[PDB]
Design an enzyme around this catalytic site. Sequence first.
Site, PDB file in Angstrom:
ATOM      1  N   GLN B  19      -7.870  -4.196   0.386  1.00 23.49           N
ATOM      2  CA  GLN B  19      -7.476  -3.517  -0.787  1.00 23.49           C
ATOM      3  C   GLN B  19      -7.813  -3.808  -2.029  1.00 23.49           C
ATOM      4  O   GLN B  19      -7.887  -3.028  -2.894  1.00 23.49           O
ATOM      5  CB  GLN B  19      -5.949  -3.500  -0.733  1.00 23.49           C
ATOM      6  CG  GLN B  19      -5.334  -5.055  -0.952  1.00 23.49           C
ATOM      7  CD  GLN B  19      -3.760  -5.190  -0.935  1.00 23.49           C
ATOM      8  OE1 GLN B  19      -3.597  -5.582  -2.022  1.00 23.49           O
ATOM      9  NE2 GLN B  19      -2.961  -5.141   0.378  1.00 23.49           N
ATOM     10  N   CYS B  25      -1.260   0.152  -3.975  1.00 22.25           N
ATOM     11  CA  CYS B  25      -1.824   0.264  -2.708  1.00 22.25           C
ATOM     12  C   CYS B  25      -0.835  -0.604  -1.632  1.00 22.25           C
ATOM     13  O   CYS B  25      -1.001  -1.124  -0.878  1.00 22.25           O
ATOM     14  CB  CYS B  25      -3.016  -0.564  -2.609  1.00 22.25           C
ATOM     15  SG  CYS B  25      -3.026  -2.453  -2.739  1.00 22.25           S
ATOM     16  N   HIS B 156       5.144  -7.844  -0.287  1.00 23.48           N
ATOM     17  CA  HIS B 156       3.920  -7.252   0.284  1.00 23.48           C
ATOM     18  C   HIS B 156       4.567  -7.204   1.844  1.00 23.48           C
ATOM     19  O   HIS B 156       4.918  -7.997   2.695  1.00 23.48           O
ATOM     20  CB  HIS B 156       2.760  -8.583   0.347  1.00 23.48           C
ATOM     21  CG  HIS B 156       1.537  -8.006   0.839  1.00 23.48           C
ATOM     22  ND1 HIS B 156       0.916  -6.807   0.521  1.00 23.48           N
ATOM     23  CD2 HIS B 156       0.699  -8.727   1.970  1.00 23.48           C
ATOM     24  CE1 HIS B 156      -0.264  -6.990   1.461  1.00 23.48           C
ATOM     25  NE2 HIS B 156      -0.267  -7.759   2.069  1.00 23.48           N
TER      26      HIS B 156
END
Lengths: 216, 216, 216
Positions: B19, B25, B156
């Site tokens: 990424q 993202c 995340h």
Amino acid sequence: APASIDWRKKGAVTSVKDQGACGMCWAFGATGAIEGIDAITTGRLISVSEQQIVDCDTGGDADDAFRWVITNGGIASDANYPYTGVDGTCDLNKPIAARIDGYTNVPNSSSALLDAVAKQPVSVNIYTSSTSFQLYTGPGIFAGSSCSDDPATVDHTVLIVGYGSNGTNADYWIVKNSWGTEWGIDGYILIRRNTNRPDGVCAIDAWGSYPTKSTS
Amino acid sequence: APASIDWRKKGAVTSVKDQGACGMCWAFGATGAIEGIDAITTGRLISVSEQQIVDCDTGGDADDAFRWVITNGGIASDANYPYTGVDGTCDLNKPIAARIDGYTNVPNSSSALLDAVAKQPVSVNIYTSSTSFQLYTGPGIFAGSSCSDDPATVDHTVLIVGYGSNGTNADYWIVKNSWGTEWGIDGYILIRRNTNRPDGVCAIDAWGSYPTKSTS
Amino acid sequence: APASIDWRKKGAVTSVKDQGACGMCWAFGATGAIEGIDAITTGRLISVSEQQIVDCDTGGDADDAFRWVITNGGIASDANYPYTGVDGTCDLNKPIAARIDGYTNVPNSSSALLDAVAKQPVSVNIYTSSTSFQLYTGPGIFAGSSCSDDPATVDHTVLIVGYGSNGTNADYWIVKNSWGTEWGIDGYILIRRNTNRPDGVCAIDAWGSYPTKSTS
Ligand code: NA
Ligand code: NA
Ligand code: NA
Ligand code: NA
Ligand code: NA
Ligand code: NA
């Protein structure tokens, strides 16, 4: 041929579709046969666009669907060209998901249909106007004592995905319909085979055909 | 469930993505879970467009990604809709590579997460702000002694692709990240499992979910 | 490496194509090598667009084709971008069917070519101007006594899909051509291997290469 087969266990059958009360939706049954040969030959199990055949080729039988897909050089996926149930503008500029090269008609002989289903899913035309067919929910084999077996009176294409036997007087076909999973046994019917009706229950053995594809 | 599984050996995991230092993202981790169920059910192992979710649905968690893919009727491939890392114009007229029908949340219980990973790759939310996580390069199990295990502080999504054990005090999860192959062990981390931290190392067992798909 | 392999039996080879009397069609041979690695790594056996390489990159060898596919970020299917045999307008806005990441050259050594074909289908450049090659119809091994084996005089890319042996003095390569199924043995030739010609019959072992792809 083997004593039984079930193409659903062999990765060649997509989810059951629900046509609803359609204005024009005659190509289900043919669509699953394309899906079957595409899975067997290319390793890809993908629903194809029943709607694209209707929009771009309109009633009809499975061979009309096969002929259109061959003429167009393929068929789009159901995801890229979704189902509406009503004839609309034909879109030809859509990605191709499956391509076939020919089709084969099965003679009106149960043994020849068994051999064809041992090879791949096979489209068949059946009579479906008896309330007993409409209201079938399993859980067992459909005997179709009120079905019309006259080949001239069939009205609907469905897809044979397998066959087997539960004992003497209990041979069957496994048939995928397009009436959703609130019909039959999760959308399938187990139709009696090897009866004393020569054209088969609901004329199932009269009009079999299947699409073929060139391979390495 | 089995004593071990590794979906990478079973044809359900695509290459590790990178990424970079992205502007937006958030959907990696969810994308690999879609790829896993698409491979298992359709025979096709294809990277899907993390960028299309970001452009067409923007932060978010894995279920936000699953919800968008379900609402859109599918997701494009990464090849047809490539990654930029920055939110840009949403393009909806792109071929569909994968379609899913639902998603399931895993309870905060290691045993339920193990059962889910025995079935398919599972997305999970973890805390990733410790320098020890950032600098993990293997070669062994990550103990995460400086990880925060508070479910409220996760930041995340990553993807559990398997689990196993190298002995007592060495049970692990196999986790795919999206930080490229110059992180971890070729882009993966082996996170200790079956510790005395109830929410799991880095809160890994708090927020598991996975996408589901209708089949024949 | 094994004593024999045939990638056609392993689901990695598409149908034989027929280039006809083309104006520009130099990328067959490379196209089947992409198809082979795409099938092995993604579970998908799909013909790719030889025409897109010609339109978007024009003569050339297999590595020119691999380089263009890598630079474009993939290649369309033959179904979505069909063959005409003549250079036409390049279309880049077409769905991507396969993507590769690199390519590898095989040294001019039969053993290194055998090792490469044990791994995947391999593109090779051969001399094809002898009438005996043109008129080969099998049914056995092609000895190529009139073939030129000078690497500098090769003129055509084809695809090695396997090898084996029928006995001493009967080792062979299995080679897919693009001259249709009315050439060779349904479009293939069995070229003698392990001869006293160091560059191989028709220089087959001089110019092998194959495309590579990143995986999990
Ligand atoms: Na037609
Ligand atoms: Na329509
Ligand atoms: Na959403
Ligand atoms: Na974008
Ligand atoms: Na090039
Ligand atoms: Na063209």
